[PDB]
Design an enzyme around this catalytic site. Structure first.
Site, PDB file in Angstrom:
ATOM      1  N   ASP A 100       9.594  57.098  40.548  1.00 47.00           N
ATOM      2  CA  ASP A 100       8.860  56.220  41.701  1.00 47.00           C
ATOM      3  C   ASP A 100       9.673  55.719  42.638  1.00 47.00           C
ATOM      4  O   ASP A 100       8.962  55.230  43.698  1.00 47.00           O
ATOM      5  CB  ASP A 100       7.779  55.285  40.959  1.00 47.00           C
ATOM      6  CG  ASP A 100       8.410  54.138  40.641  1.00 47.00           C
ATOM      7  OD1 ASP A 100       9.999  53.906  40.550  1.00 47.00           O
ATOM      8  OD2 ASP A 100       7.684  53.140  39.926  1.00 47.00           O
ATOM      9  N   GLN A 156      11.373  53.185  42.794  1.00 48.25           N
ATOM     10  CA  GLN A 156      11.722  51.814  42.656  1.00 48.25           C
ATOM     11  C   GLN A 156      12.771  51.769  41.508  1.00 48.25           C
ATOM     12  O   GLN A 156      12.404  52.102  40.321  1.00 48.25           O
ATOM     13  CB  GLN A 156      10.474  51.087  42.311  1.00 48.25           C
ATOM     14  CG  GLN A 156       9.287  51.262  43.615  1.00 48.25           C
ATOM     15  CD  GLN A 156       8.146  50.613  43.275  1.00 48.25           C
ATOM     16  OE1 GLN A 156       7.104  51.135  43.077  1.00 48.25           O
ATOM     17  NE2 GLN A 156       8.061  49.229  42.617  1.00 48.25           N
ATOM     18  N   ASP A 208      33.700  44.035  44.761  1.00 47.53           N
ATOM     19  CA  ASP A 208      35.106  44.113  44.790  1.00 47.53           C
ATOM     20  C   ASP A 208      35.856  45.074  43.890  1.00 47.53           C
ATOM     21  O   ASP A 208      36.819  45.592  44.075  1.00 47.53           O
ATOM     22  CB  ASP A 208      35.895  42.716  44.578  1.00 47.53           C
ATOM     23  CG  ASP A 208      35.460  41.912  43.560  1.00 47.53           C
ATOM     24  OD1 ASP A 208      34.637  42.370  42.574  1.00 47.53           O
ATOM     25  OD2 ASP A 208      35.909  40.646  43.648  1.00 47.53           O
ATOM     26  N   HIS A 264      37.983  48.143  44.942  1.00 44.62           N
ATOM     27  CA  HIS A 264      39.313  48.128  44.541  1.00 44.62           C
ATOM     28  C   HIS A 264      39.528  49.663  43.724  1.00 44.62           C
ATOM     29  O   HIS A 264      40.772  50.238  44.068  1.00 44.62           O
ATOM     30  CB  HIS A 264      39.483  47.046  43.420  1.00 44.62           C
ATOM     31  CG  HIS A 264      40.722  47.168  42.522  1.00 44.62           C
ATOM     32  ND1 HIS A 264      41.679  46.312  42.658  1.00 44.62           N
ATOM     33  CD2 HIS A 264      41.032  48.027  41.506  1.00 44.62           C
ATOM     34  CE1 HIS A 264      42.740  46.553  41.720  1.00 44.62           C
ATOM     35  NE2 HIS A 264      42.318  47.726  41.141  1.00 44.62           N
ATOM     36  N   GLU A 265      38.702  49.914  43.016  1.00 47.48           N
ATOM     37  CA  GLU A 265      38.962  51.497  42.454  1.00 47.48           C
ATOM     38  C   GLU A 265      38.896  52.525  43.292  1.00 47.48           C
ATOM     39  O   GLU A 265      39.813  53.512  43.327  1.00 47.48           O
ATOM     40  CB  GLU A 265      37.757  51.748  41.230  1.00 47.48           C
ATOM     41  CG  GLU A 265      38.000  50.758  39.981  1.00 47.48           C
ATOM     42  CD  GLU A 265      39.528  51.058  39.268  1.00 47.48           C
ATOM     43  OE1 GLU A 265      40.012  52.106  39.507  1.00 47.48           O
ATOM     44  OE2 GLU A 265      40.192  49.855  38.859  1.00 47.48           O
ATOM     45  N   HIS A 295      41.969  52.798  45.001  1.00 51.44           N
ATOM     46  CA  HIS A 295      43.174  53.674  44.335  1.00 51.44           C
ATOM     47  C   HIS A 295      43.056  55.091  44.770  1.00 51.44           C
ATOM     48  O   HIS A 295      44.048  55.833  45.040  1.00 51.44           O
ATOM     49  CB  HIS A 295      42.845  53.719  42.816  1.00 51.44           C
ATOM     50  CG  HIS A 295      43.415  52.241  42.053  1.00 51.44           C
ATOM     51  ND1 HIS A 295      44.831  51.918  42.572  1.00 51.44           N
ATOM     52  CD2 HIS A 295      42.871  51.535  41.571  1.00 51.44           C
ATOM     53  CE1 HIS A 295      44.952  50.815  41.663  1.00 51.44           C
ATOM     54  NE2 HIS A 295      43.945  50.318  40.885  1.00 51.44           N
ATOM     55  N   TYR A 337      52.356  54.311  39.817  1.00 55.99           N
ATOM     56  CA  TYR A 337      51.504  53.074  39.050  1.00 55.99           C
ATOM     57  C   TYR A 337      52.437  52.544  37.997  1.00 55.99           C
ATOM     58  O   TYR A 337      52.153  52.264  36.687  1.00 55.99           O
ATOM     59  CB  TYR A 337      50.334  53.628  38.449  1.00 55.99           C
ATOM     60  CG  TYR A 337      49.430  52.457  38.124  1.00 55.99           C
ATOM     61  CD1 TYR A 337      48.714  51.781  39.376  1.00 55.99           C
ATOM     62  CD2 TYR A 337      48.793  52.385  36.775  1.00 55.99           C
ATOM     63  CE1 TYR A 337      47.686  50.908  39.064  1.00 55.99           C
ATOM     64  CE2 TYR A 337      47.908  51.143  36.536  1.00 55.99           C
ATOM     65  CZ  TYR A 337      47.242  50.511  38.035  1.00 55.99           C
ATOM     66  OH  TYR A 337      46.501  49.629  37.594  1.00 55.99           O
ATOM     67  N   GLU A 394      48.105  48.244  43.138  1.00 57.91           N
ATOM     68  CA  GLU A 394      47.330  47.114  42.666  1.00 57.91           C
ATOM     69  C   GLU A 394      46.771  45.946  43.774  1.00 57.91           C
ATOM     70  O   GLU A 394      45.685  45.747  44.074  1.00 57.91           O
ATOM     71  CB  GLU A 394      47.806  46.284  41.287  1.00 57.91           C
ATOM     72  CG  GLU A 394      47.345  46.957  40.006  1.00 57.91           C
ATOM     73  CD  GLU A 394      45.960  47.250  40.167  1.00 57.91           C
ATOM     74  OE1 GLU A 394      45.255  46.170  40.114  1.00 57.91           O
ATOM     75  OE2 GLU A 394      45.464  48.189  39.886  1.00 57.91           O
ATOM     76  N   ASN A 421      28.449  37.345  49.206  1.00 60.79           N
ATOM     77  CA  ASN A 421      29.323  36.359  48.643  1.00 60.79           C
ATOM     78  C   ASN A 421      30.760  36.358  48.444  1.00 60.79           C
ATOM     79  O   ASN A 421      31.276  36.598  47.393  1.00 60.79           O
ATOM     80  CB  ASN A 421      28.591  35.872  47.216  1.00 60.79           C
ATOM     81  CG  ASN A 421      28.231  37.121  46.328  1.00 60.79           C
ATOM     82  OD1 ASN A 421      27.892  36.891  45.316  1.00 60.79           O
ATOM     83  ND2 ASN A 421      28.640  38.196  46.781  1.00 60.79           N
ATOM     84  N   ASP A 424      51.864  46.445  30.649  1.00 66.30           N
ATOM     85  CA  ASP A 424      50.867  46.428  31.768  1.00 66.30           C
ATOM     86  C   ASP A 424      51.633  47.402  32.801  1.00 66.30           C
ATOM     87  O   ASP A 424      51.647  47.019  34.235  1.00 66.30           O
ATOM     88  CB  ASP A 424      50.530  45.302  32.420  1.00 66.30           C
ATOM     89  CG  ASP A 424      49.500  45.249  33.563  1.00 66.30           C
ATOM     90  OD1 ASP A 424      49.808  44.228  34.714  1.00 66.30           O
ATOM     91  OD2 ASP A 424      48.764  46.055  33.661  1.00 66.30           O
ATOM     92  N   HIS A 453      49.391  44.419  37.241  1.00 66.29           N
ATOM     93  CA  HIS A 453      48.310  43.471  37.558  1.00 66.29           C
ATOM     94  C   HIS A 453      48.782  41.948  37.642  1.00 66.29           C
ATOM     95  O   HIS A 453      48.083  41.147  37.990  1.00 66.29           O
ATOM     96  CB  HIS A 453      47.189  43.550  36.522  1.00 66.29           C
ATOM     97  CG  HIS A 453      46.482  44.875  36.567  1.00 66.29           C
ATOM     98  ND1 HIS A 453      46.771  45.937  35.579  1.00 66.29           N
ATOM     99  CD2 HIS A 453      45.372  45.528  37.117  1.00 66.29           C
ATOM    100  CE1 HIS A 453      46.021  46.843  35.961  1.00 66.29           C
ATOM    101  NE2 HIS A 453      45.205  46.346  36.842  1.00 66.29           N
TER     102      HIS A 453
HETATM  103 CA   LIG Z   1      35.762  38.755  45.034  1.00 63.50          CA
HETATM  104 CA   LIG Z   2      11.501  53.441  38.966  1.00 57.62          CA
HETATM  105 CA   LIG Z   3      32.555  37.141  45.562  1.00 51.11          CA
HETATM  106 CL   LIG Z   4      43.307  49.056  37.869  1.00 47.68          CL
HETATM  107 ZN   LIG Z   5      43.656  48.737  40.042  1.00 49.10          ZN
END
Ligand SMILES: [Ca+2]
Ligand SMILES: [Ca+2]
Ligand SMILES: [Ca+2]
Ligand SMILES: [Cl-]
Ligand SMILES: [Zn+2]
Ligand SMILES: [Ca+2]
Ligand SMILES: [Cl-]
Ligand SMILES: [Cl-]
Ligand SMILES: [Cl-]
Ligand SMILES: [Cl-]
Ligand SMILES: [Cl-]
Ligand SMILES: [Cl-]
Ligand SMILES: [Cl-]
Ligand code: NA
Ligand SMILES: [Zn+2]
Length: 316
Positions: free
Chosen positions: A59, A61, A138, A142-143, A146, A157, A166, A183, A226, A231
């Site tokens: 639908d 929605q 974000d 972010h991804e 890459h 990497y 990163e 935000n 890592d 990171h």
């Molecule tokens: Ca953020």
């Molecule tokens: Ca639906």
């Molecule tokens: Ca935020």
């Molecule tokens: Cl990552």
């Molecule tokens: Zn990353």
């Protein structure tokens, strides 16, 4: 699929309403024909097979809890697309309007999201460490950044190259978050990390030490975990980017802030023109100085602030 371009409405992972571009052919599919070669969002249906089924809804929605990760992966892929196009004149992640495909409900309790070279893949999280990861704009940006890096500099990497890799994704992830203007902040993954705990995140660009990450080259991690700390050491470059945009006095070194838009231009130019797969932090500083020089002139405030910011984090 072939069909009519339509606009549905739904609610994302955080409970906010947003419009989404769909395609109607018996069902309403998460296929946005308005951006490049398309943005396509798929249901993996808790399997690990990719991409899964192009998301079909009766639908147009999208207010069920099960819909929310799909709403956000689709919508935030669109915002990321708009950011790179409007702000950097880059058309999709490859600069050639490549389709953006994303699969949600990947596996079960999977506390991760990744660009796999051809598409985005989002876990739902386990409900304690993460809620569905497409809920973080974000994280989405972010991804996808890459993929932008893979198609430009090709930063390796591992070790300092990998930490730049990163930090580039954290910088453009955050710039997309500010572009979306809902935000924003200089933390990473705050919207989807630890639903029980207010005010935390995976890492802080304004204060990497808040979560135990280095904010100066003298504190660089040199272990093997890592991928050599990608990171962790990203905190050093993230803090430099934060200083360039917002200013501050860091270890007694005063940096005059030049704002987010100019941070964006300087780092985008460095990434697409000057960085190479093995760029280290010193080479990043050189690329950013050269980029700010090209854009603003050698005697500019912008060049001086880039120099101050790298000085402040101990990158010569
Ligand atoms: Ca953020
Ligand atoms: Ca639906
Ligand atoms: Ca935020
Ligand atoms: Cl990552
Ligand atoms: Zn990353
Ligand atoms: Ca939290
Ligand atoms: Cl939301
Ligand atoms: Cl399909
Ligand atoms: Cl529901
Ligand atoms: Cl600090
Ligand atoms: Cl400080
Ligand atoms: Cl500071
Ligand atoms: Cl310099
Ligand atoms: Na940490
Ligand atoms: Zn400081």
């Amino acid at each position: 699929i072939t069909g009519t371009s339509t606009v549905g409405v739904g609610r994302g992972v955080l409970g906010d309403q947003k419009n989404i571009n769909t395609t109607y052919s018996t069902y309403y599919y998460l296929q946005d024909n308005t951006r490049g070669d398309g943005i396509f969002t798929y249901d993996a249906k808790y399997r690990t097979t990719l991409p899964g089924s192009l998301w079909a809804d009766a639908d147009n929605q999208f207010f069920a809890s099960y819909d929310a990760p799909a709403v956000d992966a689709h919508y935030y892929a669109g915002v990321t697309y708009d950011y790179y196009k409007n702000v950097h004149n880059r058309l999709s992640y490859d600069g050639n309007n490549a389709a953006i495909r994303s699969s949600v409900h990947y596996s079960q309790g999977y506390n991760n999201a990744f660009w796999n070279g051809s598409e985005m893949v989002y876990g739902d999280g386990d409900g304690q460490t993460f809620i569905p990861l497409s809920g973080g704009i974000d994280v989405v940006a972010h991804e996808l950044t890459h993929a932008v890096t893979d198609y430009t500099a090709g930063l390796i990497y591992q070790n300092e190259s990998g930490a730049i890799n990163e930090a580039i994704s954290d910088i453009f992830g955050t710039l997309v978050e500010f572009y979306a203007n809902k935000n924003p902040d200089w933390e990473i993954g705050e919207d989807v990390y630890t639903p029980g705990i207010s005010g935390d995140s995976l890492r802080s660009m304004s204060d990497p030490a808040k979560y135990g990450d280095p904010d100066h080259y003298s504190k660089r991690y040199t272990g093997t975990q890592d991928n050599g700390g990608v990171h962790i050491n990203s905190g050093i470059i993230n803090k430099a980017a934060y200083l360039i945009s917002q200013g501050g006095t860091h270890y007694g070194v005063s940096v005059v802030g030049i704002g987010r838009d100019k941070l964006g231009k300087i780092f985008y130019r460095a990434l697409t023109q000057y960085l190479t797969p093995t760029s280290n932090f010193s080479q990043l500083r050189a690329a950013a100085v050269q980029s700010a020089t090209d854009l603003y002139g050698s005697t500019s405030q912008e060049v001086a602030s880039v120099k101050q910011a790298f000085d402040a984090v101990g990158v010569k």
